[PDB]
């Protein structure tokens, strides 16, 4: 399975993942491609903020589903 | 000039609060008291696995926009 991650600019990030991969793992794979450390990442699926301790299968995320990425650049 | 934060209990219920990063943990407990009826002295708040201390601010603990705190009750 590949997942898709949408940025604010409109750029799509394509990731290689397994259902057993946690959100922490998913974020860590985003770091590899954009250079954004996981603490500054906030991931959304269909309106829900994703929790770092949960798997892709916990949220029932399947192949080619789109996630949204909002970055923590300013602390306000 | 506040941000949204979430407080989760074991029971599953989530509470939406409006708090300043410069607010104390004492203030948040007070806000939880207003919305739920839960006295502050019986409240225990947890962020990123650690217990939050009353005199400290959300900014002390790096509590951010849409961050989630957990509520554990005392008995």
């Amino acid at each position, epitope marked *: 399975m590949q997942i898709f991650v949408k940025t*604010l*600019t409109g750029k799509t990030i394509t990731l290689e993942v397994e259902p057993s991969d946690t959100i922490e793992n998913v974020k860590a794979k985003i770091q590899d491609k954009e*250079g*954004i*450390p996981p603490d*500054q990442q906030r991931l959304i699926f269909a309106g829900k903020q994703l929790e770092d301790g949960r798997t892709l299968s916990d949220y029932n995320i399947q192949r080619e589903s789109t996630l949204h990425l909002v*970055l*923590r*650049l*300013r*602390g*306000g | *000039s506040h941000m949204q934060i979430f407080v989760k209990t074991l029971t599953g219920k989530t509470i939406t609060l409006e708090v*300043e*990063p*410069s607010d104390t943990i004492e203030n948040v407990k007070a806000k939880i008291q207003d919305k739920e009826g839960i006295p502050p002295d019986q409240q225990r708040l947890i962020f990123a696995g650690k217990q939050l201390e009353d005199g400290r*601010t959300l*900014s*002390d603990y*790096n509590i*951010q926009k849409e961050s989630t705190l957990h509520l554990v009750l005392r008995l």
Partner: antibody, heavy 120, light 106 residues
């Protein structure tokens, strides 16, 4: 160890232009924002501009808006300040500095600054 | 824009500088310390929290629309110039206040 080193300071004539560089190490410029702040001899700090190198987002002080342009080069890990229609009041020590989400808007690492002097 | 204002105190004194720079601003207010010929250092962020490695004699408070920097007991290395920084959410402008220079009284 995060370090920011400004450079490109010096002399220009009123109406002229200069380009300042802010090179960062131990830290990726795109993981936060980058600021220029200046300080004329014997006077206070004046905020100049910031940029968010990840998005291209910029913001400038009024005293500087139409004649200064802040930029970035992520590959070089550097931020630039293109100053134009420069005038005597612009004579100052220009610092770059970064803001990192954890400090809620505050600027946490500053370079030692570079002297820009605008005069005929 | 202007020369710093001046305050004289002795080692051991309490000092509370109050921030002027702007109007409704925010609550994200930072305070910096600067010594002559050197670059500014961050002390307090978002009004009341201490930046990494700042001595506990420094504290920051908000009341109404006024922000205060307090040094509870002046040490020799605290004699310097202080600045508050304000940030307008709306206009995305940062503003540094006048600058208070705490000098040694004798």
């Amino acid at each position: 160890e995060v370090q920011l080193v400004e450079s490109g300071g010096g002399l220009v004539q009123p109406g002229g232009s200069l380009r300042l560089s802010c090179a960062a190490s131990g830290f990726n410029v795109k993981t936060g924002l980058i600021h220029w702040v200046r300080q004329a001899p014997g006077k206070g700090l004046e905020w100049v501009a910031y940029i968010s190198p990840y998005y291209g987002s910029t913001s400038y002080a009024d005293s500087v808006k139409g004649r200064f342009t802040i930029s970035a080069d992520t590959s070089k890990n550097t931020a630039y300040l293109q100053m134009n229609s420069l005038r005597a009041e612009d004579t100052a020590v220009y610092y770059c500095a970064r803001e990192y989400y954890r400090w809620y808007t505050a600027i946490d690492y500053w370079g030692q600054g570079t002297l820009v002097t605008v005069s005929s | 824009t202007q020369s710093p204002s001046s305050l004289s105190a002795s080692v051991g004194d309490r000092v509370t500088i109050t921030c002027r720079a702007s109007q409704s601003v925010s609550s994200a207010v930072a305070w910096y310390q600067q010594k002559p010929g050197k670059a500014p250092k961050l002390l307090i962020y978002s009004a009341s929290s201490l930046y990494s490695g700042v001595p506990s004699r420094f504290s920051g408070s908000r009341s109404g629309t006024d922000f205060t920097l307090t040094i509870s007991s002046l040490q020799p290395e605290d004699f310097a110039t202080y600045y508050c920084q304000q940030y307008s959410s709306y206009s995305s402008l940062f503003t540094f206040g006048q600058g208070t220079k705490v000098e040694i009284k004798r």
